[PDB]
Design a protein around this ligand. Structure first.
Ligand SMILES: C#CCSC[C@H]1CN(Cc2c[nH]c3c(N)ncnc23)C[C@@H]1O
Ligand SMILES: C#CCSC[C@H]1CN(Cc2c[nH]c3c(N)ncnc23)C[C@@H]1O
Ligand SMILES: C#CCSC[C@H]1CN(Cc2c[nH]c3c(N)ncnc23)C[C@@H]1O
Ligand SMILES: [Cl-]
Ligand SMILES: [Cl-]
Lengths: 273, 273, 273
């Protein structure tokens, strides 16, 4: 049995993707999630949708309760969390509207708790050092890549996401710099969402959608809120189709070994007295 | 009508630059500014001076209330904010005593709010993502550069400021590293001052004064508090002359289109529900 | 007269190194240290041992009270602080089990106070900007290197430690990146421990022990908590022997000029009104 958590990002957090919807507000040991969980189905598969920034997009990236969001999805019984995230492109070949099925990150955040195991919660006791060599589930990523090909979508099979704190966009010097570090796309939300999913033993993958070329590339429209939202208005349907078609495929294969290995990694990352 | 906010940095925060001075303590939604606003004039031009670290230099860079400072200057009616900032040189050609009219930054701060739009203040509602491609006003910078040439000052026309959290100085490995990233000068205060000025719709520019070569360059005196203050004692008059001569030139040209474009950029960076 | 503070890191915080042990719990203006001070001797030399993470390893790196730990050791009268720290190797030639007598750092921490002089404590008044060009005591390092050679240990004479916030391990993209920045080893605790020791006027040195190759190097066992603790179980005796044999050598040479120079650097880093 699988259950798919969906975290919707900017422009890309649409409840109408699920059939048989029911709204459920929850609390967690780490506070309230961004908004109500939306429970529902894609074909025969149970899903749980959550708007990263709230359904009215009122929560900036620095203030998103990543702990509560992941906790809530875990507690509802999710085996997988597949998210969407708008991003800037740091590579000529990654065009606005393209999907990138990211496989790595570089952290540039500064303000965010990255662990459940902070010494202050009885529900997460001990000192936990989660491995991040392979932060995203490669099996979930594989299904996303295969499905995007079946849909004929422009989709990059890997990529390194640099996650900045924000909410400001990057300077040009920063944009240039991130290119030298080997970053391929830029956003404000992947870290610590991916990290906490891993501590939760959840298969996590990210549908990154390029919306702009940040500010490094000449003769392109400058990143701005309006430019991002424009690209998403034009291209959001592709992320929706990809979730709708991927999720049944996840539901039809066997995940017990993958989930057991993740559970083991998570459990053995915690040192108790 | 222009009104010029002046934020004075280390060694470079002198009330006697203004004629017809009056002290005004203010409060803001983000707390108290570093010290009293000093209201006054340079020739016919209204100005507002504020000591970044307080007039006795009692507030370390991490604890400066950048939000309150920018808010106070905005509320007093400033159209421009021209600041001074001491810095380390990361380039042989940038000698101690030189001025750099910086045009870019790299953020290495970790502790600082970078936005007015934190979800907690009625005066700044919404989610704001300000563009930082061009963080400094190029027209204000142009007048500073032109004026420095008229004064015969050693002045670099551009440069990338890496802003570290401090209050410690950088290690040698860090200094080396920042050079590879393309940083030209190093300080602890540009970020988030520049960012918040942009959200405020204010033309912001920075008179950076090199005081040392940080710790990368052989056979130079090591950076220390005493070395910084020594260089400033010797060279502060140049920043003073540059402000005194630049500000009347700003006052004599037309800023309405520049200010309108900045106001638009700022306003359209905010998403409301 | 010398007195050697010892901070023990992961797997490497063993009270039985000291003869004539007495436990002493203390408080400081910055809160409680990680655990009781253990007072005792190595040959004729007074020492003070403190477990960085508490004796049961219950305090994650982000939550270690670096200020209290250094303060407590200073207040007990330590002239030197020699620490152990497990780390990942970022260089082929630094093999698991090797010691590195690190001489530089790159900060990647985000959550940590790095100064005693925060404006909130009467015991540390003023604005302090400590120089970090040479963060570790070269004389203490020299004795460690010489002693490791006398013991026949695999020991690297220098190295740059990148200190990450954690508690997660690095992604592969990050690991790759830190290699390009010239980092040689990776940990979560050197910063701000080294910085605060310098403000305290204490000779600080670090016995770094490589436990893994992080996640950059093919055909090596992946970093995990279990892998780290396994390497330490196998190799901790080497750090113990090195402390036991180094400390008497420190005790037998003259430190007054070295300590005076450090005290001066620390004192002149503070600006008062
Ligand atoms: C309000 C609103 C909507 S626009 C700002 C969103 C989009 N997101 C991703 C993003 C898209 N382009 C980016 C870029 N160039 N840098 C960082 N992040 C991004 C970053 C913010 O969460
Ligand atoms: C107290 C006092 C006066 S000296 C410390 C000031 C100077 N400033 C700028 C600065 C000058 N040189 C620097 C360097 N090498 N690194 C960072 N920042 C700087 C950083 C601190 O705010
Ligand atoms: C609980 C427990 C014991 S394992 C986690 C410890 C070891 N330490 C140093 C360390 C060893 N290898 C590392 C690596 N690859 N990255 C960062 N840090 C490290 C980082 C954590 O404090
Ligand atoms: Cl923080
Ligand atoms: Cl960084």
């Amino acid at each position: 049995a699988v259950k798919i958590g969906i975290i919707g990002g900017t422009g890309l957090d649409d409840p109408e993707i699920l059939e048989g919807r029911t709204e459920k507000y929850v609390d967690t040991p780490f506070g309230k999630p961004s908004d109500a969980l939306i429970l529902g189905k894609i074909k025969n598969v149970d899903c749980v949708l959550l708007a990263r920034h709230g359904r009215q997009h009122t929560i900036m990236p620095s203030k998103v309760n990543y702990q509560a969001n992941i906790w809530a999805l875990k507690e509802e019984g999710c085996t997988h969390v597949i998210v969407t995230t708008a991003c800037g492109s740091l590579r000529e070949e990654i065009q606005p509207g393209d999907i990138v099925i990211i496989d790595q990150f570089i952290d540039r955040t500064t303000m965010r708790p990255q662990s459940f195991y902070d010494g202050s919660h009885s529900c997460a006791r001990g000192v936990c050092h989660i491995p991040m060599a392979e932060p995203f589930c490669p099996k979930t990523r594989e299904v996303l890549i295969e499905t995007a090909k079946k849909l004929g979508l422009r989709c990059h099979s890997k990529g390194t996401m640099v996650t900045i704190e924000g909410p400001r966009f990057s300077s040009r010097a920063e944009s240039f710099m991130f290119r030298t570090w080997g970053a391929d796309v830029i956003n404000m939300t992947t870290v610590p969402e991916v990290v906490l999913a891993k501590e939760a033993g959840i298969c996590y993958a990210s549908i990154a959608m390029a919306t702009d070329y940040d500010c490094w590339k000449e003769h392109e429209e400058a990143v701005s809120v309006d430019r991002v939202l424009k690209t998403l208005k034009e291209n959001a349907n592709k992320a929706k189709s990809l979730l709708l078609t991927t999720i049944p495929q996840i539901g039809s294969t066997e995940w017990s070994e993958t989930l057991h290995n993740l559970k083991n990694m998570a459990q053995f990352s915690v040192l108790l007295p």
